Amino acid sequence: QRAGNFAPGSEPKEYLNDLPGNFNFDPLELGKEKGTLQRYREAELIHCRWAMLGAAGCLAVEVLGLGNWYDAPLWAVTGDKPTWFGIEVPFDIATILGVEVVAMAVAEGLRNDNQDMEKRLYPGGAFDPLGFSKDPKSFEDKKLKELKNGRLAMVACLGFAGQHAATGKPILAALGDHLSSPFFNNFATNGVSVPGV
Amino acid sequence: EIGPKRGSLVKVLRPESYWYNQVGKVVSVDQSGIRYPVVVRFENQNYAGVSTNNYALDEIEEVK
Amino acid sequence: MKDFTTYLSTAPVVGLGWAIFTSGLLIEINRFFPDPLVFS
Amino acid sequence: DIAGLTPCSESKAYNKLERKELKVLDKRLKQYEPGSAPYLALQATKERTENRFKTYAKQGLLCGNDGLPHLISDPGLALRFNHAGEVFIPTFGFLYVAGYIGHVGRQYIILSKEDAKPTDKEIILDVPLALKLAFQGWAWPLASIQELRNGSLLEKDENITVS
Amino acid sequence: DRPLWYPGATPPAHLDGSMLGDYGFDPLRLGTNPDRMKWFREAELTNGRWAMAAVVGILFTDVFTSIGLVGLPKWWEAGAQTYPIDNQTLRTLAIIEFLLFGWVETKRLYDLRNPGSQGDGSFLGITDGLKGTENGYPGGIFDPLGYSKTSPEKLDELQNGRLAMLAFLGFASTAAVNGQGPIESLQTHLADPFHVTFATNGVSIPHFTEF
Amino acid sequence: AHVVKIYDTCIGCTQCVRACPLDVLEMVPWDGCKAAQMASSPRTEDCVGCKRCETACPTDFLSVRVYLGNESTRSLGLAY
Ligand code: CLA
Ligand code: CLA
Ligand code: CLA
Ligand code: CLA
Ligand SMILES: CC1=C[C@H](O)CC(C)(C)[C@@H]1/C=C/C(C)=C\C=C/C(C)=C\C=C/C=C(C)\C=C/C=C(C)\C=C/C1=C(C)C[C@H](O)CC1(C)C
Ligand SMILES: CC1=C[C@H](O)CC(C)(C)[C@@H]1/C=C/C(C)=C\C=C/C(C)=C\C=C/C=C(C)\C=C/C=C(C)\C=C/C1=C(C)C[C@H](O)CC1(C)C
Ligand code: SF4
Ligand code: SF4
Numbered sequence A: 001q002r003a004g005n006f007a008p009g010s011e012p013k014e015y016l017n018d019l020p021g022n023f024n025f026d027p028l029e030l031g032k033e034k035g036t037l038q039r040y041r042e043a044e045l046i047h048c049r050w051a052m053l054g055a056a057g058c059l060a061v062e063v064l065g066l067g068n069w070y071d072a073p074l075w076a077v078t079g080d081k082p083t084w085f086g087i088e089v090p091f092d093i094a095t096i097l098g099v100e101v102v103a104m105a106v107a108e109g110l111r112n113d114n115q116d117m118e119k120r121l122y123p124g125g126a127f128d129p130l131g132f133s134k135d136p137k138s139f140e141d142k143k144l145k146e147l148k149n150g151r152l153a154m155v156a157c158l159g160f161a162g163q164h165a166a167t168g169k170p171i172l173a174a175l176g177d178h179l180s181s182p183f184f185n186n187f188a189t190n191g192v193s194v195p196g197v
Numbered sequence B: 001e002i003g004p005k006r007g008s009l010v011k012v013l014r015p016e017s018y019w020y021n022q023v024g025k026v027v028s029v030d031q032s033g034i035r036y037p038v039v040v041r042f043e044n045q046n047y048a049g050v051s052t053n054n055y056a057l058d059e060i061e062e063v064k
Numbered sequence C: 001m002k003d004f005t006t007y008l009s010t011a012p013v014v015g016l017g018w019a020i021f022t023s024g025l026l027i028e029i030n031r032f033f034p035d036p037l038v039f040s
Numbered sequence D: 001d002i003a004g005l006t007p008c009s010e011s012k013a014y015n016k017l018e019r020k021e022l023k024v025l026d027k028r029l030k031q032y033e034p035g036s037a038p039y040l041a042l043q044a045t046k047e048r049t050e051n052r053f054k055t056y057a058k059q060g061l062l063c064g065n066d067g068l069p070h071l072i073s074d075p076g077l078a079l080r081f082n083h084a085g086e087v088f089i090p091t092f093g094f095l096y097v098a099g100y101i102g103h104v105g106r107q108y109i110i111l112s113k114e115d116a117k118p119t120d121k122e123i124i125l126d127v128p129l130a131l132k133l134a135f136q137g138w139a140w141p142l143a144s145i146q147e148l149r150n151g152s153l154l155e156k157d158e159n160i161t162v163s
Numbered sequence E: 001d002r003p004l005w006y007p008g009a010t011p012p013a014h015l016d017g018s019m020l021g022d023y024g025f026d027p028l029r030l031g032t033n034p035d036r037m038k039w040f041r042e043a044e045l046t047n048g049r050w051a052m053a054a055v056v057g058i059l060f061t062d063v064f065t066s067i068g069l070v071g072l073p074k075w076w077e078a079g080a081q082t083y084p085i086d087n088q089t090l091r092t093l094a095i096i097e098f099l100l101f102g103w104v105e106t107k108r109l110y111d112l113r114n115p116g117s118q119g120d121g122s123f124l125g126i127t128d129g130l131k132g133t134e135n136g137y138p139g140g141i142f143d144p145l146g147y148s149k150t151s152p153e154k155l156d157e158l159q160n161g162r163l164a165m166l167a168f169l170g171f172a173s174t175a176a177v178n179g180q181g182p183i184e185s186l187q188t189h190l191a192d193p194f195h196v197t198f199a200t201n202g203v204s205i206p207h208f209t210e211f
Numbered sequence F: 001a002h003v004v005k006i007y008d009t010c011i012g013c014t015q016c017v018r019a020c021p022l023d024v025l026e027m028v029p030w031d032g033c034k035a036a037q038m039a040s041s042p043r044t045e046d047c048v049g050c051k052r053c054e055t056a057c058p059t060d061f062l063s064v065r066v067y068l069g070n071e072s073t074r075s076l077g078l079a080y
Helices: A034-063 A072-078 A093-112 A136-166 A171-180 C002-008 C011-031 D012-029 D037-058 D075-080 D088-112 D118-123 D127-134 D140-150 E034-067 E093-113 E154-177 E182-191 F015-019 F052-056
Strands: B009-012 B023-028 B038-041 B052-055 E132-134 F003-006 F026-029 F037-040 F064-067
Touching: A034 A136, A034 A171, A136 A171, B009 B038, C002 C011, D012 D037, D075 D088, D088 D118, D088 D127, D088 D140, D140 E034, E034 E093, E034 E154, E034 E182, E154 E182, F003 F037, F015 F052, F052 F064
Parallel strands: none
Antiparallel strands: B009 B023, B023 B038, B038 B052, F003 F064, F026 F037
C-alpha cells in the first residue's frame, strides 16, 4: 500500500509497513515503538483536520473581501462587535471564551473515552451520515486523500503565519507580489527570513 | 582436561580485581578440585606490584 | 655510537630539542612581525 | 560600533595613553648622548610603540571609556561588525594545532603497543617514527572523521570498571 | 599502475590496485580504508569537472578581452558588475542555487549509498535513464562517445581536471597580491620575466634587501 | 580489639605471618589450596592495627583485611 518514497532508493522502515499515507519517511525513528505510533497517527489526523478548516477560513475571508485572518480578533481591543458576513453577531468576549471551553471540553472528553483504537482515528455512524465509508475500496482510497490534502493545510497554515510576521501583507496580496515580479518579491528579499540576505 | 588451555588468553570477571574486563595469559590450571585453580599472568602490574593471580572457572571468559 | 644515539633518544634530551624548537620559533615569531594581538 | 564602545581611532584616552607612554621615553632619552647605544635602544622602543598604537587603530578595534581595546566573542556580532580576527578566527587556528598534537600522540601510542616492550618506547622514544607521524598529521580532521565513521576510534566495554 | 610521482623508491601500500590516474601519491595515507577512498574518488571528479568548466569563463573570455574584441569585466570584479545593472536579479541567487543543487546532489548522494537505486515509479517516466553504469560515470547523460571498450579516456578527464584545480588556486593567489588578472599577469612574465615573479614584486615573501 | 578476617583466596604464602610483629597470625592446614595451608587469627586482642600483613598479601585483592575498630591499651601500643 506504499503511496511512494520521499527519497527513492532509501532504506525501507518496517514500522510503517502497511498504513495509509506511507512514504517510508521517518528518518529520526520517531514511531519505532508500536504504542506511540497509534498516538501519533491520531495526532496527525486531528492536527490535519483542524488545519484544513482553518485554512479554508483564511481564504474565505480574503476571497470574499471581508478582511484579514489576522485582523479578525482586533474588534475586542477597539470595542466594536464581531461580524460574520456582516451580520453583527451580538456576543461579548467573555461569552465566547466561556461557551468555547465548556463546549469543546464536552467534545474532546467524549472522544478520549472511546477505547476503540480504529475508531479513535476513523469513527463511524453519525460522523459520516451519507455513507461513503461503506465501500472498502473508496474508503481506503479516500483515506489517502484525507491525509494528502491535510498535510498541505498544515504546512501552509504555517506559511500564513510566517509570511505575515516577515511581511504584514495579507495572503492574496503577498501572492500577487510573486506573480507580478517573482525574482524580486521573494522570501529572500524580506530582510528577516535569511540573515545576511 | 578441566579448564582452559595452556597459553590461552582469557578475560577476567571479578568486580574486585584490578584486572577486570582485561586480558591475560593462562599460566597453568590445576585439576585437583581447588576452588581457584586458574593461574593467570598479566603484563600490567597492580598497585602493589604483583602481575599474577589465581582466578576461578566462572570468573574467566573468552577473550574480547 | 648505537648507544649514544639511544641516549639521545631518551625522554630529557628529546624534550630539550623540542623546547629549543618551540621556544626558538615563538621568540623568532615575536622578533619579526613584532607584538601581534588581532590577526589582520 | 556596538555595546556603547567607541573605535580606538576616535577615542581621546587612546591618544592620551600614547602621548603618555612616549613622554616616559623622551624623558629617559634626555640622559644619554645621541649616537650611543642606549639612545638607539630607546629610539627603537619609541618606533615600536608608535607602531603598536597605529596598527591597533587601523584594525578597527573597539576602545572603551578607559581607552583600552576590547574584544568581542559572538561570531554573529563579530561578522556583522567586522571583528572576526579578534576571537572567532584564533579559535580555529588553535583547534587545528591542538588536534594535531592529539592525532600524533594517539598514533605513536597505538603503534608502539603493537610491539614488544612498549614501556621502553615511552622513556626511550623512536624518533624516526615520531617525526614520521609528526609530518603526516597535516590532515588530522580527515582521519578523525574517517576513524569515527568507521568505528575504530572508541573502545566498547572492554575497559575496567570499579564496582 | 601508471608511473610514480617520485621516480625513485617511495613504495605505496594500497594504490597498486586499479584506479584512475593512479600515480602512487598518498603520503598522508588518507585512502587506506577502501570505503572512504571510494568517497574521495567522487570528490576529485566533482571538483575536477566543476573547476574545468569554471576556468574557461576566466580563460576563454579574458583572452578575447586582452585582444580587444569584447569589453567584459574580470572575474575578480564580475560580481559587482551584475547587480547594479538596471535589469538585474538581486541575491535570491545564493538560495536558489542551493534549492536547485539540493535536489540533484542528494540524488547523487543516495546513489553512492545505494548504487542504481532509482525506483520504478518515483520519477514521472524517465526512471530508467537515470540509472548509471558506475559511480561517477552515468549513462544517459552523455549522448555520444561512451561505447568504446578501452574506456580510459578518463585519464584525460583527471589530468585535465587536476590541472585546472591548480589554475583557480593560482588565479585567486595571483589576483590577491598582483592586483591584476591572470592573462595580464602572463603578458608581464613574457615581457620582463626576471622582474615580475612571486619573489621580488609579488609579495609572497618578506624580501627587503635594497643592497 | 581490632578485627582480622581472612578470606577464601589465601594460597599459603606465610608472608602475612612472618610480617605481623605481635604474633596475631598463624598457619593452619586446609584442603583448598596447593600448599594445603591457610592462615588464622586466633589472638586479635594483641592486634596493634599496624596493617603490615595486608601489604604482605600478594593476591589480586587482599585475602587478609584488618578492619579497625575500638581501641585499647594493647592496641594503642602504650608502654605506659
Ligand atoms: C599551476 C599553475 C600556475 C601557473 C602556470 C602560474 C603562473 C604564474 N604565477 Mg602563479 N600561483 C599558482 C599557480 C600557477 N601560477 C598557485 C597555485 C599559487 C598559490 C600558491 C600561485 C601564486 C602566485 C603568486 C603569489 C604570484 C604568482 C605569479 C605568477 C606568474 C609569474 C611566475 C611566478 O611568480 O612564479 C610562480 C610561482 C609559484 C609559487 C607557482 C609555481 C608552482 C606551480 C604549481 C608549478 C607547476 C608546474 C608547471 C609550471 C606547470 C606548467 C603549466 C603550463 C604549461 C600551463 C605566472 C603567470 C606572480 C605574479 O604576480 O604574476 C605576474 C605572483 O606574484 N603566482
Ligand atoms: C478533504 C478533506 C477530508 C477528507 C477527504 C475526509 C475523508 C473522510 N473523513 Mg473526514 N474530516 C475532515 C476532512 C476530510 N475528511 C475535517 C476537516 C474534519 C473535521 C470537521 C473531519 C472529520 C471527520 C470525522 C469526525 C469523521 C470523518 C470521516 C471521514 C471518512 C468518511 C467521510 C468521507 O468520505 O468524507 C468525504 C469528504 C468530502 C466529500 C469532502 C467534502 C467537501 C466539503 C463540503 C468542503 C466544504 C468546505 C468549503 C468548500 C471551504 C470554503 C473555502 C473558503 C476559502 C471559502 C473519510 C475517510 C469519518 C470516518 O472516520 O469514517 C469512518 C468520521 O467519523 N472525518
Ligand atoms: C640533569 C638533571 C635532570 C633534570 C633537571 C631532569 C628532569 C626531568 N626528567 Mg630526567 N634524566 C636525567 C637528568 C635530569 N632530568 C638523567 C641523568 C637521566 C638518565 C639518562 C634522565 C632520564 C630521564 C627519563 C627516562 C625520564 C626523565 C624525565 C624527566 C622529567 C620528569 C617528568 C615530568 O615531571 O614531567 C612530565 C611531563 C608531562 C606530564 C607531559 C610532557 C610535557 C613535558 C613537560 C615537556 C618536556 C619538558 C622538557 C624536557 C623540559 C626541558 C628540560 C629541562 C630540565 C630544562 C623532568 C623534567 C621523564 C620524562 O618524561 O621527561 C619529560 C622520564 O621519563 N629523565
Ligand atoms: C597524546 C597524548 C595525550 C592525548 C591524546 C590526551 C587526550 C586527552 N586528555 Mg590528556 N594527558 C596527557 C596526554 C594526552 N592526553 C599527559 C601527558 C598528561 C599528564 C600531564 C595528561 C593529563 C590529563 C588530564 C588531567 C586530563 C586529560 C584529559 C584528556 C581528554 C581531554 C583533553 C584534555 O583537556 O586533556 C588535558 C591536556 C593536557 C593535560 C596537556 C597534555 C600535555 C601535552 C600538551 C600533551 C602530551 C603530548 C605528548 C607528550 C607528545 C607525544 C607525541 C609523540 C609522537 C612523541 C583527552 C581525550 C582530561 C579528561 O579527562 O578528559 C575528559 C583531563 O582531565 N589529560
Ligand atoms: C499555501 C498557500 C499560501 C498562500 O498565501 C494562499 C494559498 C495560495 C491559497 C495557499 C494556502 C493553502 C491553505 C492553507 C488552505 C487551502 C485549502 C485547505 C488545505 C483546506 C480547506 C478546506 C478543507 C476542508 C477539509 C473543509 C471541509 C471538508 C469536510 C470533509 C467537512 C465536512 C464533511 C465530513 C465531516 C464528511 C461528511 O460525510 C460530509 C461533510 C459534512 C461535507
Ligand atoms: C595559472 C594560470 C595563470 C595565467 O594567468 C593563465 C593561465 C596561463 C591560463 C594559467 C592556468 C592554466 C590552467 C591551470 C587551466 C586552463 C584551462 C583548463 C585546464 C581547462 C578549461 C576548460 C575545461 C573544460 C573541461 C570545458 C569543457 C569540456 C566539456 C567536456 C563540457 C561539456 C561536455 C561533457 C561534460 C560531456 C558531453 O557528452 C559532451 C559535452 C557537452 C561536450
Ligand atoms: S598472605 Fe594472603 S595469600 Fe599469603 S598465606 Fe596469608 S592469606 Fe594466603
Ligand atoms: S594489624 Fe598489624 S599486628 Fe595485627 S595481624 Fe595485621 S599486621 Fe599483624
